[PDB]
Description:
This is part of a larger assembly, with 2 copies of chain A and 1 copy of chain B.
Chain A (H helix, E strand, L loop, with lengths): L12 H16 L2 H4 L8 E5 L10 H7 L4 E2 L14 H14 L4 E2 L5 H4 L11 H14 L12 E3 L15 E5 L1
Parallel strand pairs in A: 1-4, 1-5, 2-3
Helix pairs in contact in A: 4-6
Chain B lengths: L3 H29 L7 E6 L5 E5 L4 E6 L13 E2 L7 E2 L15 E3 L13 H16 L2 H6 L6 E5 L6 H12 L2 E4 L12 H15 L3 E4 L20 H13 L10 E3 L17 E6 L15 H4 L9 H4 L10 H12 L9 H11 L5
Parallel strand pairs in B: 3-5, 7-10, 7-11, 8-9, 9-10
Antiparallel strand pairs in B: 1-2, 1-4, 2-3, 6-8
Helix pairs in contact in B: 5-6, 9-10
Subcellular location (chain A): Cytoplasm; Nucleus
Family (chain A): Belongs to the AAA ATPase family.
Keywords (chain A): Acetylation, ATP-binding, Cytoplasm, Nucleotide-binding, Nucleus, Phosphoprotein, Proteasome
Amino acid sequence: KPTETYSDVGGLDKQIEELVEAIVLPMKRADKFKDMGIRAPKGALMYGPPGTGKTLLARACAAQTNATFLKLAAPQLVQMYIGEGAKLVRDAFALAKEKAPTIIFIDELDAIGTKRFDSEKSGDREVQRTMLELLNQLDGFSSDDRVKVLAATNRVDVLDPALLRSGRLDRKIE
Amino acid sequence: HRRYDDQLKQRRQNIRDLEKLYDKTENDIKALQSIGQLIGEVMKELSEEKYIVKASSGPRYIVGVRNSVDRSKLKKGVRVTLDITTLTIMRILPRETDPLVYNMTSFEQGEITFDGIGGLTEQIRELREVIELPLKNPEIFQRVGIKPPKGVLLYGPPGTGKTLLAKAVAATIGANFIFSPASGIVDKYIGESARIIREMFAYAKEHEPCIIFMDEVDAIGGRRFSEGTSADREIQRTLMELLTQMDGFDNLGQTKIIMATNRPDTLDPALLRPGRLDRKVEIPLPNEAGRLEIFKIHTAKVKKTGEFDFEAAVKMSDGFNGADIRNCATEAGFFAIRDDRDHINPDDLMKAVRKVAEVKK
Amino acid sequence: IRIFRSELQRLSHENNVMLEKIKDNKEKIKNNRQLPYLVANVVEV
């Protein structure tokens, strides 16, 4: 539960309208979407230069709903022995069990999120198995609004239609 | 004083329950005294009773056989169970090198049903005859004297028709669903694409009822000029190995190779020749009549009004498959909150069009 | 108070039979487990 508001950083209300719609609304009150049977989105794809509010409004969106801030650094996801960053998918989910709400953040998604034309995720298996564990954890709770996963980076290059859906990162917020 | 007989049957159950709990503890004590073994793969076959192997826990060794050794299922290049002392083979293990259950998606039969692929029935009917038939009854084409096709090319817009047709074919046939995208092939490594196809061919060899599917094969293709390698290491090894598997001495008769790309002209014509890829199938966008059955799966499953009009949002929808309508029904709920309704309206679903039109053309 | 005490003695004694049986098992299950546990990861269950 970091301490922040939306008035500390101004001028982003254009982007905040897209953030509150894809984060605060499906999380805070889910009774409107559950009565319709549809599944609320658990995240929205975010990209932009550093300091533009992608990492500034991260704690702001977590403070409005009173959620725990978990940041995943890109250099911290690459190691020698298989483990570490690959376990952070379960580590961030482990804190989601006891704590009633949750919001998970990923800093510099392009490290593990952009495969480009290379399979190098097979070379370093901490990067690939990290994305593999996300598919299992994002499908764990379909109707639960208390588990959220977010990511922020510079730009978006490789698209993954398997990741584009309700309950995962879909809507692009620039 | 006779009321204690009810407790007699209750306490007797506890005597039998604790006796079973204390018995399982002794079984765990006896299980700790067991001795495990090692694991390795045969590097070279010296003879029938001698196999040159490579230990995972140590250097290369040459071991023998112990018992229950099936020489048909065990051969050169098969994972074995090494002995730590006498260096023998005890149990036969399936061939596994890379995380075939992680890097490659293996699921029992299919997932997506026929209602999502609807509208292609004219094309699907011709595809099932050359695919579903040789997988079920291989003796159909044996009496005719022909061979079933191997590669079948399904190409179209990204995310449209690639995921649906992948899991729908394996659902009607009954063969397992293998997802091995082409993005897990070309990298920076020494001989990566050489061992990816071999282990993929080894998995399809062990389990016959399986079908291999790929994704984004445009990056691993291309003819260059003379069809050699210039500043691309892993492309040419993929082009030749895929040609030698189907046209070689041992092909996959129980497994069909499927590729997915945007256009067939972006691939290598060497793989598009007869003998490997015999089928080029274009995936178009669903029309007004095709999308009528698409909104009847996910959108019709969620709670909606009885007066909800499906045809109202079909004219404004462009290329929305069963996966894309999940977001349309989701985005329709945001605009329906202002009206204070527990269901969805046809005009509220049409508001999700212009919202998506800001990103896509 | 009369018939119940006859069957209670049998169940109480049988509970002592497994008591001495687990008494030697509790010493084995704790001692057989190696206290300096080594870090390991199971690849396939």
